[PDB]
């Protein structure tokens, strides 16, 4: 099975700039090779062709070359609507194969995470559950790394991150951080921390609550 | 123009089968051959096969032998594709889509047909509201969360008062433990006015006919 490798897994420009998406082939797929771009809840739409052909309608800014393994798609000058997930596929070989894609993403000026922790609620705890949730929102850029601390300890396990995409008005990512323990255990723990390293600063944003402290 | 409409999103469960529909429209059925893909959450795309409609004839992906069957009504100018011993790994959106020009692969896309597999039962979620830690919070703005727990099956529409609230709210992505969803989503609000000017997490799971209400309220 010929696999399709593109450059990135996200990219940062800004609109007016030049980008270029990369992708290489396991094996000579000649000029074999599509480009699709597909927003949100819509189906992939196809841009380039046999490896350099704009399809119908396509924009003159959209472009791409070469043949063998290596191939480029290039967007002359970014426009906002262009903000989107672009896939090369190959049909030289059997099956027909695309790569995992690349997310064109917007630039724009680091912002530090607005962090806040939140101990189960009391409705939660009467089912036996204990969930402490931890927001890290807005922020920038994507890269982040947030890790739980229970009485000075480090805690991996039953920890759930779930991520927003890049926002559409501000630019900023959003993300949510869960840890899960049965009431049991949430009740033998007397501190709960959530911390979170970014770019930002050199030093953690720590957020943090005693249990039953008031 | 050219045109495929492919059939509504199917919930069933391990070893169930599926036949999902492409109307095509717009130009001859039998001028090209129709090509299904599949793409799963992460938005990776297979390509699972294609039909000639004029003959029948099929080509599938290795990967999809004995999973996947496509078929076609010439008089209906329709193509379908069945799965079956249906499994989790299944779940996914399925694609059809045809040619242009000349050699212009995957030029026109139907919109997709959902189909998720799963064993769970239908679910209500358990909504809890979060209020800001007992200690206390600084400055004027504070964000509060609303948990939404343990339902099955997606989607639920969360709201913060009933959709008044939408400028500063972030809901995140739902994951799947143990076969069920959870999901949760955080408001945050200006000016020093939560408590005073009350916030109320809405959550409506249309599967098992519920809406509930929330009100966030500072810990005691």
């Known amino acids: 099975d010929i696999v399709m490798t593109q450059s990135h897994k996200f990219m940062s420009t800004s609109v007016g700039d030049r980008v270029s998406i990369t992708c290489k082939a396991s094996?000579?797929?000649?000029?074999?090779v599509a480009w699709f771009q597909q927003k949100p809840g819509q189906s992939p739409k196809l841009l380039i062709y046999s490896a350099s052909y704009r399809y119908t309608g396509v924009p003159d800014r959209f472009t791409g070359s070469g043949s063998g393994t290596d191939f480029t798609f290039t967007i002359s000058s970014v426009q906002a609507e262009d903000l989107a997930v672009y896939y090369c596929?190959?049909?030289?070989?059997?099956?027909?194969?695309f790569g995992a894609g690349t997310k064109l993403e917007l630039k724009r000026a680091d912002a530090a995470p607005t962090v806040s922790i939140f101990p189960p609620s009391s409705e939660q705890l009467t089912s036996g559950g204990a969930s402490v949730v931890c927001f890290l929102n807005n922020f920038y850029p994507k890269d982040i790394n947030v890790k739980w601390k229970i009485d000075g300890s480090e805690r991996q396990n039953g920890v759930l991150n779930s991520w927003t995409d890049q926002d559409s008005k501000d630019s900023t990512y959003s993300m949510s951080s869960t840890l899960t323990l049965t009431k049991d255990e949430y009740e033998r723990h007397n501190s709960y921390t959530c911390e979170a390293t970014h770019k930002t600063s050199t030093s953690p944003i720590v957020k943090s609550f005693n249990r039953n402290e008031c | 123009e050219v045109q495929l409409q492919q059939s509504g999103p199917v919930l069933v469960k391990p070893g169930a089968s599926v036949k999902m529909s492409c109307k095509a429209s717009?130009?001859?059925?039998?001028?090209?051959?129709v090509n299904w893909v599949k793409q799963s959450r992460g938005k990776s795309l297979e390509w699972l096969g294609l039909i000639i409609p004029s003959n029948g004839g099929t080509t599938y992906n290795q990967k999809f032998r004995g999973k996947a069957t496509l078929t076609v009504d010439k008089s209906s100018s329709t193509a379908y594709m069945e799965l079956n011993s249906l499994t989790s790994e299944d779940s996914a959106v399925y694609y059809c889509?045809?040619?242009?020009?000349?050699?212009?692969?995957?030029?026109?896309w139907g919109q997709g047909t959902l189909v998720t597999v799963s064993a769970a039962k239908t679910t209500a979620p358990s909504v809890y509201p979060l209020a800001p830690v007992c200690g206390d919070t600084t400055g004027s703005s504070v964000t509060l969360g609303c948990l939404v727990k343990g339902y099955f099956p997606e989607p639920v529409t969360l709201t913060w008062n009933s959709g008044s609230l939408s400028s500063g709210v972030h809901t995140f992505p739902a994951l799947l433990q143990s076969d069920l969803y959870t999901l949760s989503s955080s408001v945050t609000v200006t000016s020093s006015t939560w408590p005073s000017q009350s916030i109320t997490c809405n959550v409506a799971h249309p599967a098992s006919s519920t809406k509930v209400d929330k009100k966030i309220v500072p810990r005691v």
């Open positions: 596929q190959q049909h030289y070989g059997t099956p027909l194969t």
């Open positions: 717009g130009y001859t059925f039998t001028d090209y051959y």
């Open positions: 889509a045809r040619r242009g020009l000349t050699g212009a692969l995957f030029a026109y």
């Open positions: 094996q000579d797929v000649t000029s074999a």
